[PDB]
């Protein structure tokens, strides 16, 4: 097709012309009196929400160069919310700010990559100050706390995390579940979490956490690349009858073999998921064979000739439920049987003792980990149906908290935490005098999310701002109660990890969109 | 249809126009300061890229005569990509600025004819004066050494190349597959290479490389012109029943067959690819029968009175892998027995005694070469996936430089050495004044690489042009570092094959666009 | 009021559009088979003409940027005619002609400076080329015949010529007037002529010949500047019930005097002339009364103490006829006795043996030439009226070519002398490649009248301007014959004084026009 | 002081370590350094020559040497008699930034309406 093409300035204005839309749009939900955003659909009552995440997937922009502005920005924000599970609205309003202030630089006639060397050493500096700033979070008081913070100020929350956590370990598994009646339960069972995520974002069934639940699924090993939906017939016909959810994990499945999936799941003839093996290599042939020890099934190698249409039932191994997201697979409560799994395990615990490298005994102590370790399950109870699923959403949305501020630790909230390290780094400069305006654009960026925290609560930014700054270490704005004080123990935290990682995917896409000279898209028609 | 004919200068212009878009939108990624690119993708998020390949095949012009102007030059800057594996963006800001400067040329009156032949023997001289700047690489430690300056400065990847040169030769055909591990690995197999390539773009599975590779594919020999896919179906469906990949090999597909085989590989029925058989006449048909014994497959010639719809799945040989780009195919890991093959060398070695002629003698020691030499295979190795795929695309680049490195030398990289050459032109006259201008056009042309680097570093273009000129030899500006010296020894080199096909294919466009007096195309509705 | 301001070639297409509206409606009446042009008075029927200088001065054009390119090569090309009394076409033609080639150049990006410098030096050297080929007109016998040639081969306007030119001598003052019968009559009588011509063009009463002719005036000798109209009003009132026109020899004429004057003349109440005083200072003063004494009038010198207001009739000197043009004024038959002439003369010889300086000697002589050699008059004869003032033009514009003969001499007619002369310098250089173009521009040019002379007849410019080259010497191209041959023997010739004029004065102002960067003029409004 | 707007270059030049009171200060001294070499690139861009590089090589030396651009050689400006009294340079440059200040710190102008 012939495309339009832009350049220089005319491109730059476009694309923040977008980003704006973007970012005005959800920045609006920032902070304790964040407005409401009003999301149509023609399929009943439009939606009323505060959520940022679910504004910014709305937003696609008419002009083509004005919507790559808007994509760019909210590919590289969201990432910030699966790393760290918070700060896509953090890292749009500070890519908001990084641009804007960049482009009125490079207007100037400074030049676009000391303008980014600039902000990327302000940020490096920025991370290490976060570091210093933070409180860590190691005792299972700490942890119950930080729960409940993240669960709106419950404490029932914070006690169920702490006690998963107890269970299967700081760096262990833990899903959540709906609860079978009013009292929570928990319990260990046969598990495993590989990093693969789904292959394809139309098999999302659950569109709230961006994920793939299926119950009581069989699950399909294949060591091999899928192409075809010819040599899948006889098992998806197997799968059909039996009436049960499928999982395909294989070396890939592309071309038409996915596109086929993804439609037949979307008409639901059949419900299906395919995700990557994890790992490549020889190692993927090991840890293929693991998943089938724990789920009971078989690997379908076609190295020492197995073929994928003389594959049945009894084949596919089968667990009680399989949890997938954009990044990560986790198998819940496999059917394998207890003697094999045990034996897999003293099988590599034999192969530890034989291991040369310390590379081969790092790598064979993670998959030993994975099947002895097993999954926490916690089943969240409550009087209602409707409360039931309301407290199991706050479950899982501390519980992403929490892990976070076990990594990492926790800073104060509120944008605080940001505008505290830009304070200390007045005397951070570069190689020239653009690099030190690129270094002085990103400090001043920092103050981007405290202020439109005080502007949604009806304050003057520019005072509170001043007020915060002339405090130390984790002193801050409680915007909710228009109070000054230590902001960790007024009990107004973010996780280290979600800060950082807002800041640096922030200054990622800023990054690049100034330094960007030419961009190509179709014509208006 | 009805046809839009322009004329003269009022065509002329509108080439400029189109590779104008062309040049612009992929010059500005040119250098180490090089800006980025935003392709637009309307699945998804769009593309960021430094790739002024990736740039170049998007451009496309609404205006058909502008339009026409754009595949000229993005045609012929291809092929010095083709040739070398790099210089398809410095071959189109040549284009750019021969034609820029010869149509101001034409328009004050000076014959298009003369400014052609001036700018011909302006650029015959500067390839001369290439060869003569040009540093040898010969020895095995310099072959590290400028596979490791092509690898982002990674000694692993220059002593894997080294390595790899050192035990099939300078000549050797040389593979780089996924790693199975940590480890890299170096094995030789049983394997050919032959110059035929695809037969339709549309083929290419890996856009990045620009390439078709086909994992364990069957491979039909085939002594005749397929027109019609009549005569393919008892294969194509014996094929897709095992369900792996197929390469044909025939004197050539086209009409009917070709269209049928582009539109199934796209919707992904069956995963197919053709290439001519090599060389013509009487020697095709003695190395489809070297394929054949390497592969272990039977031809399928007409002329012993075999029909292709008799062709069962035991007559096509198969192999590992084969890789096939827009000039060359390669054939990994035939399952050819070393009995047929070393019986078939034997034979060939035979026919060397008995052979009368010179010319015979040459043509049957490079079958040989072929069957006896097989083919290295680098499998490159890391800790993560990501990191694996990331040095195989480093080590695939890198050798392709190191190639031409070998053949013709490396010379000043960062547009100095063209710069350099022009400089040592400023006496070189022709049969007449236009001729003059022709020559002045092309060696004022040579210094757009560099200024076009300089100027994205934002440093004045002609300043740095001035220094560069007032030294000699390889001495010239490293734009990352901002400091003179000899280039080589820094470390900023090109191939001497990459500068002078860049230079050549460049000339060879802008000569004829200057001599264009008419153009043709279809009228916009 | 508001200015329209241009800039670079926006400017000097502008000029070059309008220059083309000039020199394309001049250019068509060149040469032996000139074409008519059709000049519009709305007081009558048209005017058609072949005369090059009454076309010319009509031309004025509605886009003021365009006007202003007619008005620069109207201006100067005037002064060739001035100077000669012929060559404002051929000075027009070649101004286009420089200038055409000369902002192809500009726009190939060559020096304006340099090009400019260029053409000055093929000038420069095309002059002294000139005076090579140069015939000397000096014996009586070469003044009838270039007076006959001049004169439409009319033996009788060639004696006449040369029989007053013997009897005033070659340095001498001619007049010719209307004759009084069949017989021509050749008298000298006491008169002088000056280098000062009218104050302003509105005098002008002759407009073919461009000239003031007062017939019987008064002349008042004012030793002052007259800037108001009240001190001349007493003498004009005087002037006016004698009926007689005035003409005015001032220091100056400016102001609100010479406006009023303007208007008077253009009405027709009173019928005067104004021109300043000969030279300046000391010298000045002398010659006013040399005027004085010849017309038999008083100086009116403010310096002893007189008034303009107390100048009566009898203060004002007369002659018989008094001619003003652009440069020049001559007084015809003063009306000062004999006595007080040939005393002012003897006063003058006895300053001369009082003088110590040479450069007091030679200003002397120069004043008793003027008074002792007094004007020759040609009455020219005929049998009508008619025939009479058409012979008087041809016997005018003759004597204007002889006197232009004698001084430089005269070389090969038909735009033959420009064409061989730069045939000559071909060989020509500067000091660079820029002035090296400006040169071959003007050489070029310089076949613009040949070509032209050549179009007009119907024959191919390249063709006859080839064979003219291909000759040495004054050979060249009889237009109006269609042969080859000695073109002073065959009688087309231009006095040298011409072709230098018009070359010089079109080189002058294609030089500033070239080197033009800006022009502001007054608003479309 | 020397001509053909060298004096103005070299001042400039010697005045690469001025500061004032904050960093919008320093903004405006190296806008008006930068703004002295406008006469100097005017009168090599009029010349036809480059005006980056010329004004590159006035730099590198000291005191009146500078660049001819009527002969196109460098050397000392007042020995070569391109020259410029000191008064005049300096009206110049004092003239040229007080109205220049001025506009820059303009917030509102009033007008006669267009008809
Ligand atoms: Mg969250
Ligand atoms: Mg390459
Ligand atoms: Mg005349």
Redesign the interface.
């Known amino acids: 097709?012939?495309?339009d093409?832009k350049?220089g300035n005319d491109?730059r204005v476009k694309?923040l012309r977008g980003v704006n839309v973007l970012a005005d749009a959800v920045k609006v939900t920032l902070g304790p009196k964040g407005r409401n955003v009003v999301l149509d659909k023609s399929f009943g009552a439009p939606t009323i929400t505060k959520d940022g995440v679910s504004v910014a997937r709305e937003i696609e922009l008419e002009d083509?160069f004005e919507n790559?502005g808007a994509?760019?920005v909210?590919?590289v924000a969201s990432k910030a919310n699966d790393a760290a599970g918070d700060g896509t609205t953090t890292a749009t309003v500070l890519a908001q700010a990084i641009i804007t202030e960049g482009l009125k630089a490079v207007a100037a006639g400074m030049?676009?990559?000391?303008l980014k060397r600039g902000i990327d050493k302000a940020v490096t500096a920025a991370v290490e100050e976060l570091k210093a700033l933070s409180v860590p979070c190691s005792d299972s008081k700490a942890i119950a706390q930080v729960g409940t913070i993240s669960a709106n100020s419950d404490e029932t929350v914070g006690k169920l995390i702490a006690e998963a956590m107890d269970k299967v370990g700081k760096e262990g598994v833990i899903t959540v579940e709906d609860g079978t009646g009013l009292q929570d339960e928990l319990d260990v069972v046969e598990g495993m979490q590989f990093d693969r995520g789904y292959l394809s974002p139309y098999f999302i069934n659950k569109p709230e956490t961006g994920a793939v639940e299926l119950e009581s699924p069989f699950i399909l090993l294949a060591d091999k690349?899928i192409?075809?939906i010819?040599?899948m017939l006889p098992v998806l016909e197997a799968v059909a009858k039996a009436g049960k959810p499928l999982l395909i994990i294989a070396e890939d499945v592309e071309?038409?073999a996915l596109?086929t999936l993804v439609v037949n799941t979307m008409r639901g003839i059949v419900k299906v998921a395919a995700v990557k093996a994890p790992?490549?290599?020889?190692?993927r042939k090991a840890m293929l064979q693991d998943i089938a020890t724990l789920t009971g099934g078989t690997v379908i190698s076609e190295e020492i000739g197995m073929?994928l249409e003389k594959a049945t039932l009894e084949d596919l191994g089968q667990a009680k439920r399989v949890v997938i997201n954009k990044d990560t697979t986790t198998i819940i409560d496999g059917v394998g049987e207890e003697a094999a799994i045990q034996g897999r395990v003293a099988q590599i615990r034999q192969q530890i003792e034989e291991a040369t490298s310390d590379?081969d005994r790092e790598k064979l102590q993670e998959r030993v980990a994975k099947l002895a370790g097993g999954v926490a399950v916690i089943k969240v109870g409550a009087a209602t149906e409707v409360e039931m699923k309301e407290k199991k959403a706050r479950v899982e949305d501390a519980l992403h908290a929490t892990r976070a501020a076990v990594e990492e630790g926790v800073v104060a909230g509120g944008g605080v935490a940001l505008i505290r390290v830009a304070s200390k780094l007045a005397d951070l400069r570069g190689q020239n005098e653009?690099q030190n305006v690129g270094i002085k654009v990103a400090l001043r960026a920092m103050e981007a999310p405290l202020r439109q925290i005080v502007l949604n609560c009806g304050e003057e930014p520019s005072v509170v701002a001043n007020t915060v700054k002339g405090g130390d270490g984790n002193y801050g704005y409680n915007a909710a109660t228009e109070e000054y004080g230590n902001m960790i123990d007024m009990g107004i935290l973010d996780p280290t990890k979600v800060t950082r990682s807002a800041l640096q995917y922030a200054a990622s896409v800023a990054g690049?969109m100034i330094?960007?000279?030419?961009?190509?898209?179709?014509?208006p028609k």
């Open positions: 097709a012939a495309k093409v350049f491109a694309m083509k790559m994509q760019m909210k590919e030049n676009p990559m000391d690349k192409s075809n010819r040599e071309g038409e596109a790992g490549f290599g020889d190692r073929e590379y653009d690049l330094t960007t000279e030419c961009m190509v898209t179709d014509l």
